Amino acid sequence: GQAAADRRTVEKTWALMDAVVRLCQNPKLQLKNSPPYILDILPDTYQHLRLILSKYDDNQKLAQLSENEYFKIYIDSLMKKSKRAIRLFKEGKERMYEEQSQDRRNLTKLSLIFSHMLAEIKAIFPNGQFQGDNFRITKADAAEFWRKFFGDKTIVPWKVFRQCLHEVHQISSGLEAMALKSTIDLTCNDYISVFEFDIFTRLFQPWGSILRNWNFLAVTHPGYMAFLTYDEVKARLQKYSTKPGSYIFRLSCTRLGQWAIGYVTGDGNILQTIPHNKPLFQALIDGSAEGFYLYPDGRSYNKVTQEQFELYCEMGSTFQLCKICAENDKDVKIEPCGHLMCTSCLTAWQESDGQGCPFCRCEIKGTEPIIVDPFD
Ligand SMILES: C[C@H]1CCCN(Cc2cc3c(c(C(F)(F)F)c2)CN(c2cccc([C@]4(c5nncn5C)C[C@@H](C)C4)c2)C3=O)C1
Ligand SMILES: [Zn+2]
Ligand SMILES: [Zn+2]
């Protein structure tokens, strides 16, 4: 059985979440209002988990929840990300109190992850009852791909998902697979939920050209600003208040799967809109043709490089993966150049007579084992 281990894991989960909440209540942080608001999200997550348990009343129901693969992965993921937030405060020290620090950007990355996890658990356990197996994917052709490979599965490991997706839409390099992972795996748990799949396929519709749409709208488009608040959109566009047709487009924590566009009017007002019954690309060319959307991020704009994939990857939390394969963790440092990669890729390059370091071609005088954090 798992009864007693399961009881222990839930209670450790709530202890670790309470620990993160207490560290975040430090007035020296000034994040009481800085949203996604970790001091709202973690209590809301606790609240939804209690609602789930409130519905899985007794020994027999609790045993069904125990056997739910999505629920097991969710609680494990919540424990790991809580431990990570604790470690960030222990290792970050007074840098947690500097707004611009890498340590504080990492707290923002964990806050976004917690926000996405709360949206996902509400989508999969609406009113605290499992509905993963009945989840209706928004885009018909995306929904057919998920039925075809995964049936009524709620969640699939990233490695399995990447292999099945590659059957229909070829993924090119390691840096593209890594960039794609960072886009679909919002919860950063190395799984793709049916919910995550729904969000990605809604944003980058149509399905027929989905990797080209994502490459063009997110990976290389100068107008794309990832997740922003309404206040951040005003702050960025204010710099172009005197150049009407200046625009950006962005994601919303509070409205997963939807785009929002901000633009500068003839009067220098900043307005925001959500594309109305059209995909983003159509909204952008239509608004372009009408004079609203002329200057992405305040400049004119007139098939993706490895460098462009690598720059996109830095926004996320995937620094532990080897850039060559995007499968194995970085476990070796090449010396003296200091480039990082997995042993497997190092071997394959020196196997096939590659000069020196795969990245910089320089003499390899030494290697040293290394553990790289996803947030490094
Ligand atoms: C909602 C508000 C909260 C306060 C911070 N601002 C600005 C900001 C945006 C992102 C981030 C930060 C910070 F954590 F690094 F600091 C800061 C991180 N971040 C982020 C984290 C993981 C993945 C991604 C996506 C992405 N977009 N371009 C590249 N990548 C990997 C968007 C997903 C569909 C894939 C983006 C922001 O959007 C956003
Ligand atoms: Zn590798
Ligand atoms: Zn090198």
Numbering used by the authors: 37 to 338, 354 to 427
Please share text taken word for word from the publication where this structure appeared:
The Cbl family of E3 ligases share a highly conserved N-terminal region that contains the structural elements required for ubiquitin ligase activity, including a substrate recognition tyrosine kinase-binding domain (TKBD), a short linker helix region (LHR) and a RING finger domain. The LHR comprises an N-terminal loop (linker loop 1), a helix, and a C-terminal loop (linker loop 2) and contains a strictly conserved tyrosine residue (Y363 in Cbl-b) within the linker helix (LH) that is essential for regulating the Cbl proteins E3 ligase activity.
To further characterize the C7683 interaction with Cbl-b and understand its mechanism of action, we co-crystallized the N-terminal E3 ligase fragment of Cbl-b containing the TKBD, LHR and RING domains (residue range 38–427) in complex with C7683. To improve the crystal packing and obtain better diffracting crystals, we introduced three-point mutations on the surface of the Cbl-b TKB domain by mutating residues K51, K55, R325 to alanines (the mutant protein referred to here as 3mCbl-b), which yielded crystals diffracting to 1.8 Å resolution. The Isoindolin-1-one ring is also located between 4H and SH2 subdomains, making hydrophobic interactions with atoms from T144, K145, L148 in the 4H domain and L264 in the SH2, and hydrogen bonds to the backbone nitrogen of F263 in the SH2 domain through its oxygen atom.
